[PDB]
Design a protein around this ligand. Structure first.
Ligand SMILES: CCC1=C(C)/C(=C/C2=NC(=C\c3[nH]c(/C=C4\NC(=O)[C@H](C)[C@H]4CC)c(C)c3CCC(=O)O)/C(CCC(=O)O)=C2C)NC1=O
Ligand SMILES: CCC1=C(C)/C(=C/C2=NC(=C\c3[nH]c(/C=C4\NC(=O)[C@H](C)[C@H]4CC)c(C)c3CCC(=O)O)/C(CCC(=O)O)=C2C)NC1=O
Ligand SMILES: CCC1=C(C)/C(=C/C2=NC(=C\c3[nH]c(/C=C4\NC(=O)[C@H](C)[C@H]4CC)c(C)c3CCC(=O)O)/C(CCC(=O)O)=C2C)NC1=O
Ligand SMILES: CCC1=C(C)/C(=C/C2=NC(=C\c3[nH]c(/C=C4\NC(=O)[C@H](C)[C@H]4CC)c(C)c3CCC(=O)O)/C(CCC(=O)O)=C2C)NC1=O
Ligand SMILES: CCC1=C(C)/C(=C/C2=NC(=C\c3[nH]c(/C=C4\NC(=O)[C@H](C)[C@H]4CC)c(C)c3CCC(=O)O)/C(CCC(=O)O)=C2C)NC1=O
Ligand SMILES: CCC1=C(C)/C(=C/C2=NC(=C\c3[nH]c(/C=C4\NC(=O)[C@H](C)[C@H]4CC)c(C)c3CCC(=O)O)/C(CCC(=O)O)=C2C)NC1=O
Ligand SMILES: CCC1=C(C)/C(=C/C2=NC(=C\c3[nH]c(/C=C4\NC(=O)[C@H](C)[C@H]4CC)c(C)c3CCC(=O)O)/C(CCC(=O)O)=C2C)NC1=O
Ligand SMILES: CCC1=C(C)/C(=C/C2=NC(=C\c3[nH]c(/C=C4\NC(=O)[C@H](C)[C@H]4CC)c(C)c3CCC(=O)O)/C(CCC(=O)O)=C2C)NC1=O
Ligand SMILES: CCC1=C(C)/C(=C/C2=NC(=C\c3[nH]c(/C=C4\NC(=O)[C@H](C)[C@H]4CC)c(C)c3CCC(=O)O)/C(CCC(=O)O)=C2C)NC1=O
Ligand SMILES: CCC1=C(C)/C(=C/C2=NC(=C\c3[nH]c(/C=C4\NC(=O)[C@H](C)[C@H]4CC)c(C)c3CCC(=O)O)/C(CCC(=O)O)=C2C)NC1=O
Ligand SMILES: CCC1=C(C)/C(=C/C2=NC(=C\c3[nH]c(/C=C4\NC(=O)[C@H](C)[C@H]4CC)c(C)c3CCC(=O)O)/C(CCC(=O)O)=C2C)NC1=O
Lengths: 172, 197, 162, 163, 172, 162, 172, 162, 172
């Protein structure tokens, strides 16, 4: 269960050395910028209903098979499973955003999710499309500058994009 | 291994060792992690062995080993294998426990194992959990025994987080086919119909 | 390990929910103290060699009986590896400073301490007073926030050894 | 894994590791003898599926005019068509539960994960309570005797689960 | 597990179709002939020890190598285990007979059984023979016309023969 | 109840361990947020007499059908209960704000929210949009740390209502 | 887990026969010199911590890369794991020595040990070398003529050496 | 594509000559044997489902070891893609019958099959026993010359797979 | 083509001056890392069939319209050409990695691909997805430490990533 500082510490310990000057420099830079990361995390947190609802709407509009009877999100319990899975993926994406590390996502939430979906007959491709629609809605919600000080967040935007892309690629 | 009311100092350490060896697998527990307050609360009977096991399940050592590095399927399998002795039977159990987790927290998730009816008869207040799926337990599938056999790799082995594989799931593959592969035949025609388009 | 951010993620993952406001407040306060902690890590990183040698000499001074033959301190390898141990402790304390949490200590020295101390017949008192000497040196090497920040981890490890 | 008095007795006997005792056979025979009214009600509903669905959607619009206006869920031609599809689903599972002489089909296929989908798609339970109340009013006249009683009971179960 | 009622439901559902009139016809027939099915199930239940003892006697008559030292059923613990296994298979056959379909027998009993016996080293040919011997010793109890109204029940006799054959083929 | 000091003491005492670095950080951070929270608490305590009326008029405006005869919002006693509900809401918002934790908020409105809402046919959307009105108006009522401190608590309340 | 007596009993039972006279002679001779076996077990128990400490000292002097940063036994927890493994294996060798057969080893000590070590990345050669060093440290204590009666115990020495060698070969 | 008609037309075009006797006699041959070929193709199109699914079953029965969990043949998608591939093969055999030439087989499935097969570790045998199943049935569904020529084309299919 | 040393000589000739000391320093830095370059290219070449196979697996999984009839991979000769394209693009990116100068990839490979796939009707977005999947599959073996001396090579990872990014943006 790792964040960026803990990965840095792990590397410094495998080498057996103290942390190097450049490492402390980049960690201090990350910590100073971290206030903006916290706002990105709060934007994901407070709006996740909206991201999930929009992603589900676009997903089932594109693939109306998953709502057909015999489709894999057909009954109310499977629709609930779909929404809950999307919400958990988004939760662990925001966890990775806070920690600035993909360890929590990859270990806790995606170590064996592909094999689970294959075992249950779930189309992993629709799962990946749900994740990508989630990332699009999350980008739109991160772009929002309401009640916050304007600034440049391209670092956080790229990290969120690569988090969602890692999620999609690990699923499928 | 039990803990009666008039128990003495002897085998109380033995009871603790059995509890740790069961709950935490064969994974080592450095006394930097043993909760001394819980042991003292057990020593006067303020809590039963069931209460002490609830405490250990809710410590950060248990969580560190079984909740963080693992998925939720693996977490449910391990919770069964450790707090109950048996493997899970079907995705009815997995779905119930995962929904209970996401809706009511790890606290209620672990309570569903500890204050359960099954735990009440088989172990109860003063019995340390033991692997009992090897012997035929009433009302099981033939896959409960197979699952406990697959989870249990030996007396020497353990279900440890800190290994090469990263503590991946052992049994969702086993528990996988019966629950949701009855509709395989028609899903085949659906997939062919999609492919032919 | 176990840091402030990691503890936030754990308490928000075990309970299976999003991050409430209070956890973000804790994260942002941790970000506030980040700069003093990393400055303390800088200062201790520079003075590593002198700190280690002074700690070793303080060990020899406080425990005169350790040095003579037939005892733990005798033999060049013994105090060379004493220096190794002291460097280990100092490195993990700087790690705690950088991580802004007691994680690396608890994972690399505390977890597993008494078994190794009692097996190889080492003494917690040697390292306790050596960390006391490191406390003495970091009293002057640091000032203000970074000073007490380093002191917090030093005496946390001391209480762990005590 | 749908639950039914047959399934319930088999499950409560497998749980105890025992053969089906007399009382479970009593319950099974009771279900078997009541099957004929339930199957009769199921076929009666199946013949009149479309009229009931259309009436239900019209009554839902009537008791909730505000949803119909634009800017709301009720707007949309295909939207309203698959509203009718949704009430068709509800009636379909009512007939399934009648055939099964148990709430298992209804429970699993609708009630399980009901409020979650209602929230996450902002679907008001009161819409569907209106629809099922209209279906109750209709089945009052179509069915009589035991079949009517069974239909009313299952509609009550679904409404209470929604309400 | 599923009876034939919920088979009809599930096949109606996965094609999104209401239950047909013809399907209601078959299920109503199932319900009317249900009382004979209850008679058959009670015949299996109340005569369980007789069926099990007869099948065991024949089984240990045919192949003595089980009961002699070094045999699977020998050490008088494994004999109790053998009788318990036969009781379990009989119980699940009666469950499938009451239900109408082999879902109980093929899910709760027969999924992990063949390789369970492979793990234990138990011969599975002997277990399948034991199941067939129970089928023989249970048809005679199932056909008992005493203390019950008389009627044709060849349908249920074929049904129970198929369930016993299914268990024996799965296990072997 | 639940404050930042609540998780401090709970996560310090669950392990049965003395208070280490991290919970001391959390206590200090909670202590520093206290005064902007108190300023915001004063600001939102002054405005309540008009805040409640603004909220009730916002509810009546958003849902035209609720106020018409035969519905929940119509009636003098019904609107009196609306006013009492909004006043209680704002009072517990101030309580959570001053306490620096949503503890009073959580165990006073969240505890028993969904079941009581379905019991008396309280549509959550009514209170969601009322709290949205309060959030929007407090956006101009407060600035700086106070604005964010109020807005995150309002967001927690509305997410609870969802 | 079978002592010499129960292993002999199991062999006799598999042959479906009473215990032979020569086998009873073997068991009587075993139980006659059993006081020597008890002395050896008490020397492995009373002088256990010295054996683990000396074996660990020699092991970590001869092979230094373990304690280096990045080494397999580097942090405190892994040193404690080393010490507990060595103590457990000495304990199980004492168990086997008292019982008289390696049944306790292959049942409990060595049941899945190689699987565990291949999962943990531990070099099994190092663990085997540690067991060898425990052998050398333990033979000194077993051969201690002081505080016991003088008598030949070469059979016990060979038996304990075989136990340690079997443990090493199973780990290796 | 590649047909005896196309072979004639290309082997006349590349030399820029008008057609003479030999190739137009071959054209007579094609046009006379079209009818048995086309009715054979009709019959094969008439019975496809049994052919494909029983071929899949025959592959399982001849290779039980690919069915179990944990190997490449295992998987619902894997069975679906079995049926897909064998359906394609039946497709193209019918096409070749229609064209009265082995062209379309060569153009589509014979061109580059080796390296794509070893790309996914596909065993061509599996398809060969599928073809064996297919010849087993066409020994019954067809009669004489149509049967003979369908057997010829499928045999060429194995030979290319061989 | 024009390797890194060729590039240095080219710029030296163009400005007409000798090598500066910094030029010799950077060329020596390239010379010393040539061992790491050999390791990287060996890893890529040895794992090439596996990498391209799994990459094509994710390719056809993510986009299921290419394989099916009417797609540019359907006629199964196009499949062979597709495999040839993946292997050749990986071959030239391995070439560019070995040379350390992206000139060979830009000239010998990417000069005409754009117009080529316009003339061939291939979806080029799909090909960009393909090469991105290549880098994703290849970085696995890149950070693999099997059978080789361990060491940080972050520059090699970044250079390989930039090479694949150049290829992707080219065919994009
Ligand atoms: C904590 C980390 C974690 C997660 C999140 C996880 C997800 C997960 N999804 C599951 C099944 C499922 N997953 C889905 C959702 C998919 N199907 C639809 O097509 C969608 C496109 C798509 C959602 C994006 C559905 C519908 C099921 C039910 C399958 C069934 O009942 O047959 C299951 C097994 C039963 C259950 O639903 O609880 C799990 C455990 N597993 C984990 O260890
Ligand atoms: C206690 C919980 C918490 C809150 C309520 C919070 C809001 C918050 N945002 C801040 C700065 C900021 N916040 C942002 C982020 C925003 N700007 C962009 O428009 C983005 C769209 C958007 C989010 C990604 C930026 C860019 C800054 C200024 C960067 C800096 O710190 O210098 C600050 C520091 C005030 C200052 O620098 O004077 C706070 C307190 N941060 C927190 O940890
Ligand atoms: C995680 C970091 C870490 C620690 C802390 C650690 C402690 C440690 N100290 C050891 C030996 C030792 N360490 C000392 C230290 C003494 N030397 C002087 O005399 C002083 C009085 C005193 C130190 C202040 C001595 C004398 C020994 C030799 C005693 C023995 O090996 O049993 C050993 C035995 C293995 C070896 O190093 O060869 C360990 C594991 N090992 C680690 O990997
Ligand atoms: C098998 C049981 C089952 C049911 C019943 C079910 C209901 C259901 N209701 C939905 C939303 C909806 N529900 C409605 C129906 C409303 N429209 C209003 O006019 C009426 C008051 C009311 C009908 C009484 C509408 C229009 C939507 C679409 C809203 C939107 O997407 O904009 C959706 C989302 C489908 C999509 O992607 O568009 C489902 C699946 N799902 C199930 O799996
Ligand atoms: C609920 C469904 C279910 C079934 C059916 C089931 C079968 C089953 N029988 C077992 C034992 C056994 N069963 C037998 C019976 C065989 N010996 C002879 O060959 C006979 C012909 C034959 C009996 C028909 C024996 C000998 C054992 C003990 C095996 C041993 O100790 O080696 C065991 C191992 C647990 C134990 O020791 O009791 C299982 C799991 N388990 C289940 O959960
Ligand atoms: C208390 C639990 C319970 C039982 C036991 C039960 C069986 C049962 N079987 C009945 C008739 C019958 N029972 C049987 C079955 C028998 N006839 C065949 O020849 C076989 C010997 C055998 C079946 C293999 C038949 C064929 C009928 C006539 C009903 C018909 O015409 O379909 C009747 C009506 C006659 C009466 O009440 O005396 C009952 C109640 N029903 C119950 O609620
Ligand atoms: C401890 C803090 C507290 C909360 C959170 C609270 C909410 C609350 N509102 C209630 C009733 C009510 N609340 C409302 C108000 C709603 N209906 C419409 O008028 C409006 C659109 C809308 C308000 C904007 C109404 C009309 C009732 C009457 C009962 C009913 O709705 O069935 C009740 C039932 C018991 C009662 O108070 O009389 C509770 C518990 N009450 C509290 O003491
Ligand atoms: C039947 C009784 C029993 C045995 C035999 C047993 C072996 C055993 N040793 C373990 C760890 C370990 N054991 C060692 C010690 C070895 N590595 C070094 O090379 C040393 C030289 C050498 C000691 C001889 C180490 C270093 C680990 C930790 C490896 C890791 O964390 O990756 C573990 C993993 C438990 C955990 O997660 O902490 C087990 C199960 N466990 C048991 O319950
Ligand atoms: C805790 C219970 C208990 C124990 C275990 C015990 C040990 C014990 N040691 C004995 C002597 C003996 N002990 C030994 C064994 C020694 N020979 C040496 O070379 C070795 C260092 C060592 C064994 C490896 C021998 C050879 C004898 C003389 C008796 C004989 O030869 O059988 C005797 C017989 C009395 C005697 O003749 O002195 C006992 C009972 N006494 C007890 O009350
Ligand atoms: C023009 C006609 C045509 C041919 C000849 C053709 C060959 C072919 N078969 C494929 C699917 C496949 N087909 C098989 C083999 C079948 N499935 C297994 O279960 C059985 C052992 C076996 C049936 C006997 C496999 C293993 C794959 C996909 C490879 C994989 O995903 O691992 C693929 C795509 C590979 C993939 O999706 O990963 C190709 C190119 N495709 C075509 O469109
Ligand atoms: C015949 C062609 C040839 C090959 C294949 C080759 C590989 C090679 N790499 C070496 C050192 C090395 N090799 C590498 C590269 C590897 N280590 C890193 O961790 C990565 C896993 C990976 C690169 C991505 C490194 C870092 C060194 C150590 C050199 C240094 O100090 O930087 C050595 C010297 C050590 C020995 O001989 O055992 C060889 C032979 N050299 C050759 O002449």
């Amino acid at each position: 269960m790792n964040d960026v500082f803990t990965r840095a510490i792990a590397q410094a310990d495998l080498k057996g050395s103290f942390l190097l000057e450049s490492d402390l420099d980049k960690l201090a830079s990350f910590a100073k910028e971290g206030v903006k990361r916290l706002d990105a995390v709060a934007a994901l947190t407070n709006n996740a209903p909206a991201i999930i609802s929009d992603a589900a709407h676009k997903l089932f509009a594109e693939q109306q098979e998953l709502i057909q009877p015999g489709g894999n999100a057909y009954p109310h319990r499977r629709m609930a499973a779909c929404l809950r899975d999307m919400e958990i993926i988004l939760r662990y994406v925001s966890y990775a955003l806070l920690a600035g590390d993909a360890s929590v996502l990859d270990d806790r939430c995606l170590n064996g999710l592909r094999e689970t979906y294959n075992a249950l007959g779930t189309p992993t491709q629709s799962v990946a499309r749900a994740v990508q629609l989630m990332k699009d809605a999350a980008m739109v919600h991160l772009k929002s500058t309401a009640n916050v000080t304007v600034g440049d967040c391209s670092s956080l935007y790229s990290e969120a994009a690569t988090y969602f892309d890692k999620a999609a690629a690990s699923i499928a | 291994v039990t803990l009666r009311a008039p128990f003495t100092e002897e085998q109380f350490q033995g009871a603790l060792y059995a509890i740790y060896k069961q709950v935490f697998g064969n994974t080592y527990v450095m006394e930097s992690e043993r909760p001394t307050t819980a042991e003292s609360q057990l020593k006067d009977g303020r809590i039963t062995v069931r209460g002490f096991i609830r405490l250990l399940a809710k410590t950060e050592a248990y969580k560190s080993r079984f909740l963080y590095t693992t998925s939720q399927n693996r977490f449910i399998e391990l919770n069964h294998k450790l707090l109950l002795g048996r493997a899970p039977y079907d995705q009815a159990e997995i779905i119930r426990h995962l929904d209970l987790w996401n809706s009511q927290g790890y606290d209620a998730e672990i309570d569903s194992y500890i204050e359960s009816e099954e735990y009440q008869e088989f172990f109860g207040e003063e019995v340390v959990p033991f692997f009992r799926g090897f012997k035929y337990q009433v009302g099981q599938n033939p896959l409960g025994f197979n699952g406990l056999v697959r989870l249990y790799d030996g007396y020497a082995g353990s279900d440890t987080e800190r290994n090469q594989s990263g503590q991946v799931a052992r049994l969702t593959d086993r528990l996988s086919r019966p629950v949701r592969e009855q509709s395989s035949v028609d899903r085949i025609e659906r997939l062919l119909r999609s492919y032919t388009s | 390990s176990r840091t402030v951010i990691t503890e936030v993620i754990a308490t928000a993952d075990s309970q299976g929910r999003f991050l409430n406001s209070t956890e973000l407040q804790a994260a942002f306060g941790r970000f506030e103290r980040a700069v003093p902690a990393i400055e303390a890590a800088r200062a201790l990183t520079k003075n590593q060699d002198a700190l280690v040698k002074g700690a070793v000499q303080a060990v020899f001074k406080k425990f005169p009986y350790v040095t003579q033959p037939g005892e733990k301190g005798y033999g060049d390898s013994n105090q060379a590896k004493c220096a190794r141990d002291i460097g280990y402790y100092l490195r993990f304390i700087t790690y705690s400073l950088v991580a802004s949490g007691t994680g690396p200590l608890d994972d690399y020295v505390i977890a597993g301490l008494r078994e190794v101390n009692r097996a190889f017949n080492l003494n917690p008192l040697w390292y306790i007073e050596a960390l006391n000497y490191i406390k003495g040196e970091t009293g002057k090497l640091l000032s203000g926030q970074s000073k007490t920040e380093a002191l917090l981890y030093i005496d946390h490890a001391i209480n762990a050894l005590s």
